[PDB]
Design a protein around this ligand. Sequence first.
Ligand SMILES: COc1cc(Nc2c(C#N)cnc3cc(OCCCN4CCN(C)CC4)c(OC)cc23)c(Cl)cc1Cl
Ligand SMILES: [Cl-]
Length: 260
Amino acid sequence: SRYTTEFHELEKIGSGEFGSVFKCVKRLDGCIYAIKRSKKPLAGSVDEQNALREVYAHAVLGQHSHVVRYFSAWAEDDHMLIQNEYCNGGSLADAISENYRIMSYFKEAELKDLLLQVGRGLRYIHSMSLVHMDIKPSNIFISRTKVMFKIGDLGHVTRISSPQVEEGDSRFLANEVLQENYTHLPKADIFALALTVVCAAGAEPLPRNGDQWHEIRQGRLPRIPQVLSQEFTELLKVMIHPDPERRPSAMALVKHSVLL
Ligand SMILES: COc1cc(Nc2c(C#N)cnc3cc(OCCCN4CCN(C)CC4)c(OC)cc23)c(Cl)cc1Cl
Ligand SMILES: [Cl-]
């Protein structure tokens, strides 16, 4: 098995609907990698599509400091193995869960840093005529010594010119995408980033549907318990503006004054 030949497994660090993730050391270089193990996708299926969307995206983007690196992919028996860059701080979703456990939180300065760094990631991706289409806390990773945020899971990445949309998490999805309007897809990433920061700021779990869902797509920011500057709250608000064209672009977001 290539997996045991090339790597030594240190511990299982994640398991879910989309596979398990293992912290592994590669024998040859002594470096740590995050390896995802999953069911070999059915040939001709959506899962296969996701997998190929992912390879294409990394192939186009190459290495970028705000995108989780993608090294190699192969199969053993009925399973797919993918070797990724290890982000020792875990996912943002897990950090938020940790913040709750120990009564800690991301103050405003750190939220701006989050918004800025992931924004730079989005700016690069969009500059390459790609959109991510699944920005959410479980797809943002943390690399630390002091902190680097990185965009992971490129399985939904598609081309702005002639897109194939596998619609992302309903809780982070812009209304226009739900309406099968695929004409301003980069602004969908922007919308999703705002709500990602909103979760990190300590907002209640986001709605999947119903009144609360629509209220947000009306441009209403979910309730956040910590005090934030109005200038910052207004920035998050315009990022979920019902008109996608009124939302800042990534390049506009990173050039924005309100961020460091
Ligand atoms: C959503 O999509 C994808 C997500 C992943 N997942 C990860 C990537 C990536 N990429 C990178 N880095 C990761 C780091 C993780 O944990 C770091 C901290 C672990 N600690 C070990 C020590 N003890 C004491 C506490 C826990 C991690 O854990 C769940 C998952 C990671 C992959 Cl591999 C592929 C896809 Cl497609
Ligand atoms: Cl509904």
